[PDB]
Structures are given as C-alpha cells and as structure tokens.
Amino acid sequence: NFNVSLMEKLKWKIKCIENKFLNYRLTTNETVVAETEYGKVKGVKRLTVYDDSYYSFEGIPYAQPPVGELRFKAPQRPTPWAGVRDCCNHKDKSVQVDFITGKVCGSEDCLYLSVYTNNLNPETKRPVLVYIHGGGFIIGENHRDMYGPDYFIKKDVVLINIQYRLGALGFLSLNSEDLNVPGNAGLKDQVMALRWIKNNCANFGGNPDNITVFGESAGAASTHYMMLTEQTRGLFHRGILMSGNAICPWANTQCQHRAFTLAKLAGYKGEDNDKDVLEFLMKAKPQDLIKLEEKVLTLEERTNKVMFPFGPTVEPYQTADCVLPKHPREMVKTAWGNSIPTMMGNTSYEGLFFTSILKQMPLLVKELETCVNFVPSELADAERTAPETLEMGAKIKKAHVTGETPTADNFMDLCSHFYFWFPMHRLLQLRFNHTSGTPVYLYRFDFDSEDLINPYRIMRSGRGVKGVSHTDELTYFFWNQLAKRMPKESREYKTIERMTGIWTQFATTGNPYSNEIEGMENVSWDPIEKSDEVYKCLNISDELKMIDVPEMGKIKQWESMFEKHRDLF
Amino acid sequence: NFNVSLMEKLKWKIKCIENKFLNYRLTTNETVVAETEYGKVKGVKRLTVYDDSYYSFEGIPYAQPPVGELRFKAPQRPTPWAGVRDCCNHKDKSVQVDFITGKVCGSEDCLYLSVYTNNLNPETKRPVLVYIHGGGFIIGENHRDMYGPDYFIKKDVVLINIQYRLGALGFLSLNSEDLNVPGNAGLKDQVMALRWIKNNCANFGGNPDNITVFGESAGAASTHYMMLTEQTRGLFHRGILMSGNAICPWANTQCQHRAFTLAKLAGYKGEDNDKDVLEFLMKAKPQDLIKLEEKVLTLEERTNKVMFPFGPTVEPYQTADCVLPKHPREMVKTAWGNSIPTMMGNTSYEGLFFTSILKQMPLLVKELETCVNFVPSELADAERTAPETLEMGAKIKKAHVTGETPTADNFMDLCSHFYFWFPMHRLLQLRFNHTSGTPVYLYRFDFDSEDLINPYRIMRSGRGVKGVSHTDELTYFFWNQLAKRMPKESREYKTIERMTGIWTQFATTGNPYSNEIEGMENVSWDPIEKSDEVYKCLNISDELKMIDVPEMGKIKQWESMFEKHRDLF
C-alpha cells in the first residue's frame, strides 16, 4: 500500500529527464573491449560529477533469457556470440511494479550483470565486490540511476551489480515434481551470476580468490542464502549482511498454494492441480501476473505478518539446481559461509520505514495493545488466542510500549526488532551454538542527513522525516539520480569515503578496520564472541565510535519469550 | 608417450575437486537394498544434471581380490557375506598410469562392477547392457567421472560397467604349465563378471535372457573375445563392437618372453626362467611393475607396430578357465557369438587421435616413404626389406600419401585403416567365407563438436582439433566430469538421444532401426550381406543417413595386398 504524492511523481519524472542529460555529459568517446567466456564485450569510460573516471560494462548476460518454456524454471547457460557485444547501455529490469509511478515496468529478459572499474589493467588483481540489490524480491535493478558505481570507483576494486528474477516470475513454487518448478529461480539466477563472476572477473582485473558479496535488505538475505547453499560453496570470500539475513521473517515463505491463487486473479478458470495452473500461468502476460501479486495474500496471512506472496522457499523435492533444500535455520548449522569473514549491521531506526504507511492506516498501532501478531510463528498458535501467546505478546509490549497507549513511535521501534535486530541476534547465537563460525563484525549506521538522499525516501514519503531509516545507508554507497556533488569537507561526503572505505577494507582483508580512514584512528573494532553478553559495534555517526549495541536490552527482552522453548532459539 | 601440459593438468586437478562436490549435490537421501547370490547390497538414488534419477550400485565384487598368491592368476569366486554390503561409492581402479597426471594410481583390489537403473521394480524384465571400457588394456575404469550412466538411465534398461585387470597384472603370460600363469587373466575377469551378470541381473530388474555386451576400442576387442570364447557360450544375446575387434593387430600379442624384460627393469637379478622370474614379480611392488611397462617394448617390436607389451594372448596350454586356446581369427570360425545380432562401427577420422604424437615426433611420418611397417605381418618378411613387402608397402602408400611427400594427415588416414577399417573388413569377410554368421549392422560416427567433450581429448591434447577422433563418440554415451547440461534443442543433446536410443533399440530387439528415434525417419538400415561388394553404413552426423562407407575404396586397396595370398586374407 505504498503511495507517492502526485507532485513527488512530477518531481521524479523531471528528475528522470534531467538524469538522461547528465548521463550523456558524463559519457566519454572512449570505448574498450573485454573478453568473456561467452565472447567479447564492449564497454565505455564514464566520468563522475567528482571528475573521477571508470569503465562501464552493462547488460552482460549470465543466463539465457528465461522466456517461453524457460518461464519459472532454473536459469540455463547463455549461448556464445561471435563478434563483439555492445554493453555501453543498460538492459531492462525484471518485471515489477515501479515503486514510484505504481505502473508495471521491466521485462522478462532481465538476467544481466554490470561491471565497473577505474582501471581495466591494474598492476594487481583487485578485490571484487558483488552487490545484490534489495526490494523484497519484488522490486529493484542494477541501473546506474539507482546504483551508480561513482563512489566505489574512487577505490581500486572491481564492482559488479547483478540482476535476478523478481516476484512470481522469480519465486513461483509448485509441489508436483513432474513440473520442474521447485521455486527459487531468482536465487538460482544469483548462483549463476556468482558463477559467471568467479569465471570472468579476472578479465576485468579482479581477483577470483578475493570476492566479496554484499547486499542490503532482501539483498542481504540473498547474500546470506548465497553463503548457506551448497551450490555456491567456496565461490566467494567475504560476506556483508546489510539490514537483513536469511532467518528474517520476511525473507522466506511456503508459497506452494499461492500459485493457484495468482492464476485465479488472472482469470483461471480451472482446477487446483499444479499441472493446469502452470499451463495457464505459462501463457499469462508477464505484466498482468505482476500487477496482481499485491492481492494474492489473504488478510489472515497479512495479519500473521507474511510480507510477500512469493519469495525464497524450502523446495518440496530435490533437483540438481536446488538452492534451499531445508529451513534456513537448519542450513545455517551446516553452512560453508560460516567459515568466511562476515560483517552485519542495521540502521539505528529501521522501523521509521513505516512512517507514512502508519499515516495511511492508523488502526495498526492497536496491534500493540496485545503484541500477538508479532510473536514468532514457532510459538504462536493457529488462532493466536492461547494464554501462552498472550503472555509472550506482553513481553514485547513491555519492550516497546512507552506509555498507557501504544503509538506510532512504539510501532516503528517494535518493527526494527521484529524485522531486523531480533533475527540478527538469533542468527548470531545459532551461528555460535551450532557452528564453529568465524566471529562477526557489527556496525550500526546512525548518520542522519536530509541533504543527500536516495529514491527510497520518495517511495516511503520520508522527505523531512528526521532519523535513520531502513534503506538510508545506500545513499553513502551508491550514486543515484537524486544525488549531487558534495563539497569535499561536508558531513555527507566524509560518510561516503568512510562507508566505501570500510567496505573496501573489509573486502580486501576480512577486517573492516583501517587507520587510513579519517575518523577511525583510535577505534578498537572487535568481532563478536560466543562469550559476549552485550554486542559491541562501530556506531557510524558524525564520529566513528565503538559503543555496545543500544538495542541489546530490548533484544534480550525478545529472547525471554523463548525461556520455556529454548531449543527453537 | 602421451604428454599433457601443466596448464591442462592444473585445470584437470580443479575439475576433479569440483566434480566431487557436484557428486554430493547430485546425491539423494534415498538408499535401496538388493539381493545377490553373495549377499545383500546397499545402493543409492542419485540425480542427473537433466534431473533424472537412477539407482546406483558401485563396488559389487564379482571375484576375489587378486592379491598375495592370487596375483597374475585366474579369478576366484568371491566370498558370500551376511548383512548389507555397502555399494554407495566407487572402488579402486586397476593399477594404472593416470592418463593425465602421468602418475601411477589404482589398486590390485579392482574386481568390481557397477549397476545402474532408473527402476528396481520395473513392469518388464529390462534389456541388460554390459559396457566393457577401452584403454589399450592398460588404462580405464568404471568410475562415473569417466563413465557416467546418466544418459542411458533415460532408457528402460539395466546398465552395468565392469572392471578387469590391466597391464602386466591382467595379461602376464608364461609358458611353463606348472606355474599356472597362462595369460588372459583380465579377460578371465570379464568372463567372471558376465557370469555374475547372467546370474544376478534379475535381482535388479534385468532380463537374464536379454543381455548386450558393448565396448569401445580395447573394450570392443574385449567384447569380441567374449563372443568368441566357449567360456561364455550362451551368456549374452547382442554384441556391439565400437572402433575395434579381436583380430585387430593391437588387440592381441604373444607376450611370453616379456615377463623377463619387465622383471629386469624392476631389479631382477637371475636367469631367463619362468619359475624364478615369476617369484620376483610376485614379491614385486605392483606400482613398480606398471610404471616400468612403458620401457618393456624394444625398438624392434614397436617398429613392427606391437603397441602394448602385455595384452590378450594365445594361451600356450589348456586350463579349466582358458579364454583363448587359438589365434583369434581361427576362433572366429568356431565362435558361438557368430549367431547373435552384431553391430559394428568406427568414427570418420579415427587416426586423428595420434595428432599430438606427430607434433611431438615429426620423424614418424618418414615410415610412409615405403609403408613397409604397416604391412600385415602375415605378408611381410622379418626385417621388412624383401622385394615383395616393398611392393605391398607401395600399395599402402598409393592409398594414403596424397601429395608427393608424406605429411602428418597421410599418417593419420593410414592409421584409421591399419588399426580399424581394414581389420573390420577382414572380420566381415572371414565371417562370410567360413561361417554362416549373422549379417552385421554397420555404423559410422561422423559428428563433430567442441561444445561437449570427454577426458580422452585432454589426454590426446585435442582441445583445438577439428574432426572426429577415436574416442569422440563416448562423449554421447557416458556422462563425464568435463560434461555439462546441454539444451534439448542443441545438436549435442540430440546426438546423445540418438546414440543412446539406437543402442537401446539394438539391445532390445537386435535391429538398430526405430521410427521412435528423432533422426531415423526414412532410413532403411540393412545389415551387410555376403554379396555386397561395397559396404553400407548408417552415418551419424547432424543428420542420420544410409550411405556407402566413404573409406571403401582405400579398404579394397588394402585388400589388394593379398592378391597373391588370397588364402591368408
């Protein structure tokens, strides 16, 4: 139910127009060819508004276009071309509802990756940074107007921005084994992209034995799944989980009966058997299926906090390309990615994301009178009325409800733990108590600014809203069409250098610490220990500071829910 | 002889690593137990890249481990066992020089067979296919990283792959009857395994009354030998000879004196005496015997084109287990196997195999000045300088030297005929003049691809070479670690379907034709009849066509050497 001011839409439209002109003025007459395993690609040198330069390769295919017969199926190897492929322009994004215009946009032909570097023949093979975009497995792209590499190319890395399939086209799951639609096609897209990166990044000056995958939100859950699944074993070497992981409630779902339901909304007209539902969905118009996803969830599922109709899932039977054979919790216990350096973190006010949704639908704070809807499904009964479940809601009410009446602030603070802090805590402990995993570095993004923004602020109508929301940190990692040239001495600019500098440092060494990052002199950044009772993290504000996590107290309160059921923690 | 580059060896090494984890990814949690006359055996359900499943039993002993006193001796019945024997992994290959790493690997403990089928409980008693691997009788195995059943298990058949003893450990031959080392130990393993199969294939859903033995190259000569020996009279019902047969000149050898020569290279010591030479080789380290067998052949012998020092031999005295009491061509006249449906074939450029050898040894092409060294030993004088043999060599030369000076390509053309096509001619004709044996169906594999390969291409440094070498057809019968999933529409996948379908068709009925097979509409595939002056063959490339053998003209030029010796032909 995300709505955007009609003026903001006009203002966004004029920005799209203006961004086309800027993009041209930063394009150079310098093109260049790189080799790949499937053939030659042609890129272009581009400039930044800071007058840095980099080589851009966009729309490199890592898989066959998943159309016709390939709809809902695992991606297959792309086919080699002779000659030279023009990669001087972006290709289209995955079919999705545009988060601003509310229109359906994109294309089924979306399996592409983009490669950026400041030097195509460096004296050393560079760290490779792979970004998986977020958007709830329902939106997002690798377009430079949302995820410009302009900041990262100040640093000596190869940066790669991937696409993957989204929504029902990415994540439709059917139980029938005859059909070859187990689910997670968009996740298997990512695996194949990652595989391409390992086999080809050297051709762009990157070190295949030094690959970092990071992502934010659904991109972080994606990164984690890429660290869990046996498909990607040993393929990368560092992982960064930005505001998300694979055991977040929103990060997965058993969507196997939602396909008959999607077919129905599209004009089916047949029986609830997987075979005929797939037959019909295989003829449906892509844009129409995507249009109707928002109505697939029943009020009961929405009330039980199911976020999306289609997403990552436990696959109902084994296949060769199976990415998620068991529950994420179970896969953690056996995860190869436990063995690699890991950095995690969240913004300092994640739930602030829901500010204008609560304005649209104010009858939501009443869900805090009893916090029954936010009790983890493991503990909550079917009807969610049993005294054990009320007793536990009460534990959450105590942690978040500030007065005698629950408010907007309480709800948004509760969401920060429900969607982010608590799952990350659980992952940290489960990681210690069932695996020998390499300790994790924690950060906390707490830098607020209204002077430089990204387009997610528009989507949630968060302009002028003070506080550091889910999504706010991407502004200091990526150029976007709403960004601007900042004075070299300003607050926002130094955060860019810090964030990009810390991620680069972590991608290089496995340790985010550097004394060459201004503000980070005198910082003692320790990884989290099994023994630790309170986590310590680098709080990223105007100054960099090692505080212990302020959310700890409340995280401990959420943990008490599991007092009697200590094995499900 | 065959050398592999460091670059290719490194790539092979990492391919082995990757294959191991792909093997785990392709492994189900489904195990099954089957009966044997020796005890119960545990197997596993395994997936395929195309997402087919099959039940896999590896490491079923059909004989006693030929160690200690059993070395060089005929194989002995295995010992029965109580409970469930585990057959979820491959056993060792026969002691061997690795055809890529150049290092000795494998073990004396190698008398095992594997059994694969998509169904333990089929509706019919299925055709049983029994593949005998090639490798000149010195290399080879039944591991699925070289001979993967993944393609055949698409068909409703039982597929079985045997191991047998290689090199000196399987083919030592000594004249003295007291010592009981007559020769053909490895072929005796083959008899043993076949008997196990007759007696046990019904336990896996096979038809004891419908068994096909097929082998490529030395496995083809092995297959022929099994069709020739009284030891196996009755056991099986079809035979397919792929690039070779028992009257090929590399396919047998009188190796009796060479046990001394090997024993000498290894340290011995005493006199040219079958008793003492044997005592030494018995105490000797198996890996030392195999490493040195490369040095056993004199210059004399390999000039005369003796290719292997140890191999199938005419046994000097009769034993209960004797496989070969006479010369192969005399055994053809008596062979039980002449009455069973037979398929024979060759590739369209078998000699292209020696390509790297000629690059390594350009001096080799000088043997084509006279061609004296390629003259059938039947026809040639000892030192190969007599007027009559210069004239016979002159007839070989006219057939193959295209220009005026002999090139590498004339050498390879010649090799196609000397090793394969001519012996095949001679076999068909021998079966006509001296037997009322069955009309043989002939095929020609003529499909070239660089998109899908097998390890032998690595071995023969054939990565870049255009044309269809000896060994190239196996890529379309067996999965291997260098293989990948192909698209259903691709020219390679379609070949796999055809090859596998034709083999399965011929295994079922004894006629290789079916209109079920995609490229086999409008093909009248008749077998070769006594009256045919020009052979007719199914040619397999992108299309499937009945033609006359393109090599027929040169075959008849080879035959003209016997003009004055019609009796020896």
Side-chain angles (χ1 to χ4, degrees), chain A residues 1-44 46-306 308-383 385-403 405-434 436-569, chain B residues 1-304 306-364 366-569:
Chain A
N1 270 307
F2 266 113
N3 292 269
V4 180
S5 175
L6 221 73
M7 160 213 67
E8 295 282 356
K9 289 173 162 185
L10 170 84
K11 284 169 93 152
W12 170 263
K13 154 75 166 163
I14 58 187
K15 278 274 184 199
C16 291
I17 299 169
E18 285 171 13
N19 194 73
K20 291 210 299 295
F21 293 139
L22 184 62
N23 174 62
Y24 169 75
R25 286 191 270 114
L26 308 167
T27 316
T28 299
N29 276 246
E30 203 187 321
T31 67
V32 63
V33 182
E35 307 272 12
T36 216
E37 62 181 314
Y38 305 106
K40 275 180 257 279
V41 295
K42 183 175 88 213
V44 61
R46 302 189 184 277
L47 314 180
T48 299
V49 296
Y50 291 105
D51 282 299
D52 293 298
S53 61
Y54 68 99
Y55 302 88
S56 192
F57 298 81
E58 288 172 303
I60 304 166
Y62 65 78
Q64 210 75 242
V67 293
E69 278 218 79
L70 298 164
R71 196 126 136 202
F72 310 123
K73 317 292 198 292
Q76 320 297 333
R77 269 195 328 288
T79 24
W81 54 87
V84 180
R85 194 191 179 88
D86 191 343
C87 293
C88 295
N89 202 23
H90 62 94
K91 297 271 208 172
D92 222 317
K93 67 193 70 177
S94 197
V95 188
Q96 72 192 82
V97 179
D98 191 281
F99 62 155
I100 280 161
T101 74
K103 285 193 152 215
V104 177
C105 69
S107 167
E108 277 193 281
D109 185 352
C110 67
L111 306 195
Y112 296 102
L113 81 208
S114 297
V115 189
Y116 310 114
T117 184
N118 68 35
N119 184 353
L120 214 33
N121 223 295
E123 57 263 53
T124 98
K125 23 77 199 299
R126 300 177 155 180
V128 180
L129 284 65
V130 186
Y131 187 69
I132 315 186
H133 75 89
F137 305 99
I138 67 163
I139 67 171
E141 59 293 299
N142 74 356
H143 289 195
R144 284 184 299 101
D145 68 321
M146 300 287 317
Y147 296 93
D150 305 40
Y151 316 149
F152 275 113
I153 59 93
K154 298 168 105 70
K155 294 276 167 176
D156 292 13
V157 292
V158 167
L159 174 72
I160 301 181
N161 285 240
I162 71 171
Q163 288 191 332
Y164 54 98
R165 273 171 294 173
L166 299 165
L169 283 50
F171 294 94
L172 202 95
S173 190
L174 297 173
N175 285 317
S176 182
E177 184 177 23
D178 283 353
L179 271 29
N180 209 45
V181 192
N184 300 159
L187 256 29
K188 297 163 167 57
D189 290 351
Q190 301 174 183
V191 168
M192 187 167 200
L194 255 32
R195 276 181 185 146
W196 182 100
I197 288 158
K198 191 91 184 185
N199 288 334
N200 296 268
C201 67
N203 302 146
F204 296 91
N207 184 18
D209 301 345
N210 197 29
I211 304 172
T212 300
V213 183
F214 70 122
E216 202 260 349
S217 197
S222 306
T223 299
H224 200 24
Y225 287 130
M226 290 305 101
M227 298 165 75
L228 303 181
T229 181
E230 285 294 330
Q231 297 300 340
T232 57
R233 171 165 223 95
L235 231 45
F236 58 98
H237 318 264
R238 293 87 171 77
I240 310 165
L241 261 33
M242 303 169 60
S243 293
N245 65 45
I247 66 173
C248 293
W250 53 261
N252 61 55
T253 188
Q254 293 314 298
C255 50
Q256 285 77 29
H257 306 111
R258 311 217 176 98
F260 170 66
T261 308
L262 173 63
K264 278 160 71 198
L265 266 17
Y268 187 78
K269 262 63 180 293
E271 177 58 36
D272 199 348
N273 82 94
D274 290 335
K275 193 177 147 86
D276 289 345
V277 169
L278 182 67
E279 166 74 22
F280 183 87
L281 294 172
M282 214 82 85
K283 326 181 82 62
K285 169 56 214 175
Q287 85 201 323
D288 287 347
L289 260 29
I290 295 293
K291 252 188 269 298
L292 300 154
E293 278 188 55
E294 76 189 27
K295 296 170 185 171
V296 171
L297 294 179
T298 47
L299 193 66
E300 18 284 328
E301 281 165 356
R302 312 195 100 103
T303 296
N304 293 329
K305 296 291 91 129
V306 177
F308 312 99
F310 299 98
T313 197
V314 177
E315 299 176 57
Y317 54 90
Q318 189 177 340
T319 57
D321 293 338
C322 182
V323 166
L324 307 174
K326 288 155 174 283
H327 294 275
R329 281 183 56 91
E330 302 298 303
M331 293 179 78
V332 168
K333 302 174 174 286
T334 193
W336 78 265
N338 285 338
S339 53
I340 59 154
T342 291
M343 170 151 169
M344 300 171 191
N346 296 292
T347 80
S348 63
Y349 198 178
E350 240 121 9
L352 197 67
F353 195 64
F354 296 87
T355 192
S356 98
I357 307 180
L358 284 164
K359 210 195 192 303
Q360 201 90 19
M361 215 175 164
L363 291 78
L364 259 62
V365 295
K366 284 176 170 192
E367 290 196 355
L368 260 63
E369 289 158 340
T370 88
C371 287
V372 155
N373 307 304
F374 294 103
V375 179
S377 288
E378 294 87 284
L379 308 164
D381 61 290
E383 291 276 69
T385 57
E388 338 288 288
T389 311
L390 281 151
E391 185 178 294
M392 291 174 183
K395 281 184 191 73
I396 311 176
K397 172 173 196 160
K398 222 232 152 204
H400 304 275
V401 182
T402 266
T405 305
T407 58
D409 310 79
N410 302 340
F411 184 96
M412 294 183 295
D413 184 41
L414 186 152
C415 285
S416 289
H417 290 78
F418 186 67
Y419 294 108
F420 304 104
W421 287 106
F422 185 55
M424 113 147 179
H425 173 73
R426 283 156 93 7
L427 171 59
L428 253 16
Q429 295 310 300
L430 180 58
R431 204 175 157 274
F432 282 135
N433 282 347
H434 280 100
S436 58
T438 65
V440 181
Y441 296 91
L442 296 185
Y443 72 91
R444 188 182 186 253
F445 195 81
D446 189 22
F447 181 80
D448 182 35
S449 178
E450 180 58 51
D451 283 345
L452 201 71
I453 64 173
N454 73 63
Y456 275 116
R457 188 172 303 258
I458 315 305
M459 187 207 68
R460 70 178 192 274
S461 308
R463 210 196 286 267
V465 179
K466 158 185 71 186
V468 194
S469 161
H470 175 74
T471 257
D472 282 356
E473 80 272 36
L474 300 150
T475 300
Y476 310 94
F477 287 99
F478 294 105
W479 175 266
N480 70 85
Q481 67 170 42
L482 302 173
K484 79 249 260 63
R485 205 248 195 263
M486 296 310 270
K488 227 71 156 166
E489 63 285 337
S490 66
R491 301 176 65 235
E492 309 76 4
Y493 184 84
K494 325 181 114 185
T495 312
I496 288 156
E497 303 212 83
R498 286 172 193 176
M499 300 302 82
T500 294
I502 291 164
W503 269 228
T504 299
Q505 174 60 34
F506 186 84
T508 315
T509 55
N511 186 343
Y513 170 82
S514 191
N515 59 27
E516 299 190 346
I517 300 163
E518 159 234 24
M520 183 170 265
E521 310 95 352
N522 308 127
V523 163
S524 185
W525 204 341
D526 289 350
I528 308 298
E529 319 300 342
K530 194 190 208 179
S531 325
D532 285 325
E533 50 300 292
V534 179
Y535 310 135
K536 20 88 263 310
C537 65
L538 185 76
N539 195 245
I540 314 153
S541 185
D542 262 291
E543 63 158 342
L544 310 171
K545 197 159 86 99
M546 291 289 305
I547 64 174
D548 55 40
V549 176
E551 281 72 15
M552 203 70 258
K554 289 174 197 172
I555 294 174
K556 281 320 221 169
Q557 294 208 246
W558 275 72
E559 189 184 339
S560 65
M561 285 192 290
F562 285 80
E563 271 171 334
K564 20 189 74 199
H565 315 270
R566 198 60 191 174
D567 59 296
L568 314 174
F569 182 88
Chain B
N1 210 28
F2 275 103
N3 203 68
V4 194
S5 71
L6 293 96
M7 182 270 302
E8 291 298 352
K9 287 160 74 176
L10 185 95
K11 272 176 167 160
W12 179 252
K13 163 168 139 68
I14 74 167
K15 276 280 169 183
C16 297
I17 297 183
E18 278 167 348
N19 191 66
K20 183 164 75 182
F21 288 101
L22 173 62
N23 194 74
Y24 297 143
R25 292 189 277 125
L26 295 173
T27 300
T28 315
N29 297 348
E30 196 187 318
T31 68
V32 58
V33 180
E35 294 271 2
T36 297
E37 85 189 276
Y38 293 104
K40 309 156 159 290
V41 293
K42 197 165 100 156
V44 67
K45 194 207 199 192
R46 305 179 178 277
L47 292 179
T48 259
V49 295
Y50 301 99
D51 274 346
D52 297 334
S53 57
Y54 60 103
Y55 294 85
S56 153
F57 299 87
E58 303 174 81
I60 310 175
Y62 60 82
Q64 274 307 281
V67 309
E69 284 173 302
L70 289 167
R71 188 144 98 183
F72 303 123
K73 316 280 188 309
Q76 310 289 19
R77 275 195 329 283
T79 54
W81 61 83
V84 193
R85 176 189 186 92
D86 174 292
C87 297
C88 288
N89 284 116
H90 63 66
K91 298 295 287 197
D92 296 289
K93 55 182 83 197
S94 176
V95 194
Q96 208 166 316
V97 180
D98 188 288
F99 63 148
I100 290 159
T101 78
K103 311 282 263 289
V104 171
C105 65
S107 153
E108 292 193 80
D109 194 350
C110 64
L111 303 189
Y112 299 94
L113 56 80
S114 299
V115 184
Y116 317 104
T117 179
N118 66 30
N119 193 357
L120 277 329
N121 290 298
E123 36 262 300
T124 81
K125 300 174 79 203
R126 293 174 166 194
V128 192
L129 285 76
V130 176
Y131 183 70
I132 313 188
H133 73 74
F137 307 106
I138 65 163
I139 61 152
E141 31 40 68
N142 64 7
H143 305 165
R144 294 180 291 107
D145 55 25
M146 248 82 87
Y147 298 99
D150 307 58
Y151 306 152
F152 270 113
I153 53 92
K154 260 152 135 73
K155 299 287 168 205
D156 288 307
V157 298
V158 166
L159 179 54
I160 297 171
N161 305 250
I162 71 181
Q163 283 193 351
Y164 57 98
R165 284 170 277 173
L166 308 173
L169 263 14
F171 297 91
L172 211 80
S173 184
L174 306 166
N175 281 321
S176 149
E177 184 173 22
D178 298 317
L179 279 18
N180 193 61
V181 183
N184 296 144
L187 299 171
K188 288 151 185 188
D189 301 345
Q190 286 167 197
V191 166
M192 197 100 158
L194 249 25
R195 294 182 177 153
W196 185 99
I197 290 167
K198 176 66 126 181
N199 277 7
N200 283 297
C201 58
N203 289 127
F204 298 80
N207 187 359
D209 301 299
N210 204 21
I211 317 167
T212 303
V213 176
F214 75 118
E216 182 281 339
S217 204
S222 280
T223 297
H224 198 33
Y225 284 125
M226 298 301 94
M227 293 165 74
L228 291 182
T229 193
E230 287 303 329
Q231 292 289 339
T232 60
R233 155 161 249 121
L235 276 57
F236 62 94
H237 316 273
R238 292 97 177 69
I240 318 169
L241 269 40
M242 312 174 67
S243 302
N245 63 54
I247 67 163
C248 283
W250 51 266
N252 54 97
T253 177
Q254 302 296 284
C255 46
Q256 288 81 28
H257 297 318
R258 295 173 195 157
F260 182 55
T261 294
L262 174 62
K264 270 188 73 186
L265 277 345
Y268 182 91
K269 203 108 80 186
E271 296 155 355
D272 204 347
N273 171 69
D274 283 357
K275 174 91 95 72
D276 281 291
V277 164
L278 189 68
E279 147 150 83
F280 182 89
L281 302 161
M282 221 59 47
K283 283 158 128 88
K285 185 64 189 164
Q287 303 172 126
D288 276 4
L289 269 18
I290 292 316
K291 214 239 302 286
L292 285 161
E293 77 182 351
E294 73 177 52
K295 294 197 182 83
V296 167
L297 284 167
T298 73
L299 181 90
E300 171 92 283
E301 282 159 336
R302 65 225 303 170
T303 296
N304 293 351
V306 181
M307 303 310 294
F308 305 103
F310 301 95
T313 208
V314 180
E315 308 180 42
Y317 56 84
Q318 204 183 345
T319 57
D321 295 279
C322 185
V323 170
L324 305 180
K326 276 210 209 287
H327 279 290
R329 75 178 279 119
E330 288 314 302
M331 287 182 60
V332 171
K333 302 180 176 174
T334 303
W336 75 263
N338 285 342
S339 64
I340 77 181
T342 320
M343 192 168 163
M344 297 174 200
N346 286 308
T347 70
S348 42
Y349 203 165
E350 229 100 24
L352 185 72
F353 191 77
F354 307 94
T355 213
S356 171
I357 278 173
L358 290 169
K359 183 258 225 285
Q360 206 90 318
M361 290 188 76
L363 281 46
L364 204 64
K366 268 204 179 168
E367 281 182 294
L368 271 68
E369 246 106 62
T370 42
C371 287
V372 161
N373 292 343
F374 297 105
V375 168
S377 255
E378 298 91 293
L379 295 182
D381 79 293
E383 314 149 27
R384 304 178 92 108
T385 56
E388 43 273 45
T389 136
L390 267 58
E391 171 203 338
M392 280 160 180
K395 271 163 262 160
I396 293 177
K397 184 186 188 170
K398 176 157 194 156
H400 297 287
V401 177
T402 314
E404 316 289 348
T405 35
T407 64
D409 292 299
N410 303 334
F411 191 95
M412 297 188 302
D413 191 39
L414 196 159
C415 283
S416 295
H417 285 76
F418 172 66
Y419 294 116
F420 305 100
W421 289 98
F422 193 50
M424 189 202 73
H425 178 47
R426 300 185 71 186
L427 179 52
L428 282 348
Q429 297 310 313
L430 186 60
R431 282 173 86 264
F432 284 135
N433 293 19
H434 298 89
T435 82
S436 71
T438 62
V440 171
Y441 294 88
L442 287 187
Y443 75 82
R444 190 176 180 269
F445 191 80
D446 181 43
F447 177 85
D448 198 2
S449 171
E450 203 63 67
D451 286 347
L452 200 72
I453 64 170
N454 73 77
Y456 268 121
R457 183 175 299 259
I458 298 315
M459 153 169 183
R460 73 176 199 256
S461 317
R463 279 260 201 207
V465 188
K466 211 182 186 289
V468 190
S469 177
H470 163 87
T471 274
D472 290 4
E473 86 284 34
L474 295 180
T475 298
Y476 315 99
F477 288 99
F478 308 97
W479 170 266
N480 68 69
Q481 68 169 27
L482 307 174
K484 45 167 90 135
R485 192 208 220 271
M486 295 308 279
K488 260 136 49 190
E489 338 88 58
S490 80
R491 61 194 291 268
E492 289 92 0
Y493 185 82
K494 280 185 214 149
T495 293
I496 290 171
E497 294 180 315
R498 296 162 176 190
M499 290 312 91
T500 240
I502 290 171
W503 264 232
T504 295
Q505 175 58 46
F506 177 81
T508 300
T509 55
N511 185 326
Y513 176 66
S514 182
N515 42 65
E516 250 108 70
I517 295 149
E518 187 152 44
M520 260 184 157
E521 300 81 0
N522 309 128
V523 158
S524 185
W525 191 353
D526 295 315
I528 305 312
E529 304 282 345
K530 196 167 170 167
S531 56
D532 302 331
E533 230 270 8
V534 186
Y535 294 155
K536 303 146 187 272
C537 79
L538 177 69
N539 191 248
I540 298 139
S541 49
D542 285 69
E543 46 176 43
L544 303 179
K545 313 262 104 164
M546 291 308 295
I547 54 162
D548 43 42
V549 177
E551 297 80 13
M552 196 79 201
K554 293 165 180 182
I555 295 175
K556 272 276 153 38
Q557 292 182 245
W558 275 77
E559 195 188 323
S560 72
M561 284 176 55
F562 294 93
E563 271 166 17
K564 294 178 173 176
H565 305 284
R566 284 309 298 171
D567 64 321
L568 292 180
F569 176 67

